[PDB]
RNA sequence: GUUCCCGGGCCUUGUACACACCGUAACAAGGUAACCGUAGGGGAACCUGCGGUUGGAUCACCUCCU
RNA sequence: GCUUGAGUCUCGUAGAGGGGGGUAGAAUUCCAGGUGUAGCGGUGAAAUGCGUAGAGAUCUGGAGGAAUACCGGUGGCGAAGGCGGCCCCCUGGACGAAGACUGACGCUCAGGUGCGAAAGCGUGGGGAGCAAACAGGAUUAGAUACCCUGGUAGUCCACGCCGUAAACGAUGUCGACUUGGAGGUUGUGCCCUUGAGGCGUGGCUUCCGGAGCUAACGCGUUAAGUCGACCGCCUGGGGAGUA
């Protein structure tokens, strides 16, 4: 909206653009995460984990 | 803005409680305490055409407060002028 | 202040300079001070600044033209 | 007694001997009522405008709890030290801990 | 309307200037309390802190002298 | 001469005069051009067309020096500031960057006075 | 085609005018807005500097971003 | 004797509020040095002045002097006047949640006392910019008048004197009462401040309106509406707010 295009170009580069659309725990399950299989970008590493 | 751990000592002396600073004998003393730390400014700086309105204000308030205690309780007033020495 | 742009110009591009002040401080430090002046003219300016909003309130209720 | 936020800076030249100079100032506080809250070391980061010639100074923040009459004379020292060029002392309020 | 003055409480500091870039322009010009959706209190306190950031060489005056 | 590539053209437009002074980054001036030194005496100096003739008198007197990637350091948003920077970008110059280096005063001293 | 030029009408702004537009300082923005306070000066109105206020006038056009 | 009046404390905030001193940076007048040109400046126009004794212009170093663009908001402080960088110390006034009290300690005025922008002057210093008296060139029949270049007084720091105003939101002051909206500025209490808020309460200020007043415009919880308390002023203009 026009009342958030102006406020958008002030409070940073990414104010109200990036949202939270994460991968969530499947609805209806109660378990325990044991191992994490990660694949870093082919060429550039991740951050720390 | 005032010296709290000196004035709280005063309400401790004059007051029969710690919350009782509504009695004439205690309030005029807290007013004189203000004047005791006010001398420090009317000795220096010289150009206080603004701070002058504070002098005349608190002195007026004080002159008439001790002017009523005088007209009602000469027991507390003579004890007050003999307890703080706010006469001279 | 400083515009550059490596190649896609074919123009000078001094649009942020004007978008900065340009005449903003030119009109304020070029002639005599006269401390009170702006205050009075911002007066007529402010009343006419509320007037267009008064025109916004003058277009919403009727205008059955 | 009072919460202070002494934020001073030095030139990169004295940046290799200022750690010793921080021990200089914090010596006083320690033996005369004091405890530090946030000693920050940023490094020789980019300055704004060149200080008469060279840019990029060494930032050192203290933000220590100290007495008012000591910091009075302590800022006098900042005023005439060759490491510290510019400083800034604060009033009371809250004590910091992160700022990063 | 923004998710920053909905989590912004009690005097924004003068140390790291990354968010001060979000109130000033890339010229050295400050935005008024009306453009930025921020009560005068805040846009003004940020401002005073910035003048002190000039006495500390965090931000310069205008871009170039 | 000078072996300069960075021709710093200081374009200063007062009110009724466009005086451009090409120099070096060090200050070694090369010469100048003006809306009043080419003629146009009167409200004619007030026109950017005279400032256009100005940017041309400044476009020359540099063919012995050799400015190519020049810097346009503007101050004085009077008669010029428009058809002067544009005249240089039309005189065959590859301006690396047009600079508006204005060390504006906080109005410390008291300035002159005009139209009353 | 109404932006040039002569005359006309409507709406509108403005007036200490309605007996009705030796020097112009106020009344249209009188083409230099006004008045009070203070010092000084010049045949003289008034002017110059400093502080304040509204018992002042248009915010209409010409170039750029949606 | 008792409390809705006045007032203070415990617990806090904000501020062109004042005061003494010190400091940062830009611009300007000017000085030294390298480069370099014949114009700069000004106005409707011309001109005084400067210029090969090299001005204006550019970069570096720098000493006096006064003042704070952008943050700036019919916004904030105050009895009023008046007042815009930052720091250290001093400090008056205004306001609020929850309690504790003497118990009307409240309001105002002739004589009286204090503040008093700016200006005049005395005195120890000062003079960048502007600029009373005045000089040159023009508009002009004339210039001691719009303009430009110079320039004494003044402007500033500190102590005093005559003690003045459109010292005017022209609205005297303490206080109580009287359907709302757009707001702005500064705090606070309650609910999950999840959140950019909802419900009340005080200070200052602006616009449109009801009650009411009024010649009218309009003021309109900051009143010119309704009362009480205290003081000054007017009896047509001028003379004169003068000897």
Descriptive keywords:
part of a larger assembly; 6 chains; D: 100 residues; alpha+beta; three-stranded antiparallel sheet; 6 strands; 26% helix; globular; F: 116 residues; alpha/beta; five-stranded mixed sheet; 5 strands; RNA-binding; ribosome; 30S subunit RNA polymerase complex
Give a short synopsis of this structure.
With 65 residues, chain E is mainly alpha-helical. Helices cover 20% and strands 0% of the residues of chain E.
Separation, N- and C-terminal Cα atoms of chain E: 37 Å
Question: What value does the Rg of chain E take, in angstroms?
Answer: 12 Å
Shape summary of chain D:
globular
Strand proportion of chain E: under 5%
Question: How much helical structure, as a percent, in the residues of chain E?
Answer: 10-25%
Radius of gyration of chain D: 13 Å
Total strand segments of chain D: 6
The major beta sheet of chain D can be summarized as: 3 strands, antiparallel
Q: What percent of residues of chain D adopt helix (DSSP H or I)?
A: 25-40%
What's the helix-strand series of chain E?
A: H
How large a portion of the residues of chain D is in β-strands, by DSSP E?
15-25%
Q: Which of globular, elongated, flat, extended, rod-shaped describes the shape of chain E?
A: globular
Total number of distinct structural domains of chain D? 1
Strand order of the largest sheet of chain D: 1-6-3
- Biggest interface: chains and residue counts? C-F, 20 and 26 residues
Oligomer: part of a larger assembly
Number of helices, counting only DSSP H or I runs of 4 residues or more of chain D: 2
The major sheet of chain E is characterized as: none
What is the H/E string of chain D? EEHEEEEH
Modified residues (N6-acetyllysine) (chain D): 93
Protein name (chain D): Small ribosomal subunit protein bS6
GO molecular function, one term (chain D): structural constituent of ribosome
Function (chain D): Binds together with bS18 to 16S ribosomal RNA.
